[PDB]
């Protein structure tokens with residue numbers, strides 16, 4: 704995350720972190736239930752064998768509430784391609800159930816129609832992750848969150864050098880130095896409605912970070928709700 | 938106006954059945970007796986930042 708702030712205690716309880724065999728985070732995820740993580744398909748290429756860490760806010764210290772969970776089943780959307788980055792979505796079934804507690808709890812899956820007309824027509828959403836704090840910087844050791852404006856879809860496609868498909872939406876700022884970044888991929892984009900946070904996006908890709916005239920590209924969760932539902936019975 | 942007016946007074950999901958508001962809730966919540974509010978069934982309902 705570039706700009707924004709640290710998630711304070713209990714603030715971002717649905718954040719998961721995919722860690723490699725060197726125990727370092729390379730991508731984010733969203734907790735959907737005790738067995739299921741939502742992340743991006745392209746993250747599945749960023750490591751050979753990985754696990755999922757939950758409850759972490761500061762990777763430099765063992766705070767006590769952290770838990771690592773082995774991945775039992777990887778479920779990768781078969782339409783994903785690095786050529787296009789379309790269908791950038793995966794669900795992970797964990798071998799052991801996540802125990803919910805301080806800093807560990809699921810984000811809500813919304814209904815499609817309601818989410819589309821009520822959540823994505825709000826001013827902003829919230830993205831979070833342990834990714835780079837500058838386009839050229841290293842990964843954050845602290846969990847961060849940033850409020851990001853929904854971007855008009857026309858403006859979104861004009862600003863992009865790559866084809867923005869119907870499975871994608873834009874969020875962020877034209878010029879201000881706030882954005883997601885490398886390492887935040889796979890993580891939560893959530894939208895708040897009366898103090899309840901619903902998953903609305905998956906951090907996917909972007910032409911660098913916080914750059915003038917460029918926005919963050921997020922996988923549109925509402926276009927995969929049926930698919931997610933099925934993956935959670937698999 | 939229905940769902941378009943202040944989410945039909947629903948806490949969460951709103952849709953219109955036969956020209957009237959029907960509210961419903963995410964998994965882990967129960968619709969309250971007024972048919973609008975959503976009540977958590979456990980200690981860590983989805984979408985809530987953890988305080989307690």
Ligand SMILES: Nc1noc2ccc(-n3nc(C(F)(F)F)c4c3C(=O)N(c3ccc(-c5ccccc5CN5CC[C@@H](O)C5)cc3)CC4)cc12
Pocket residue numbers: 785786787788835838839865866882883884885886887888906907908909910911912913918919920
């Ligand atoms: N702004 C953001 N919101 O979320 C994000 C998540 C990750 C990043 N990111 N950081 C960096 C770094 F500059 F730090 F390296 C990079 C990226 C990032 O995705 N690239 C990127 C750019 C375009 C595509 C893309 C978009 C549409 C279709 C296909 C592709 C892949 N092709 C292979 C060849 C490549 O040119 C295009 C994929 C990744 C850039 C690096 C930014 C954001």
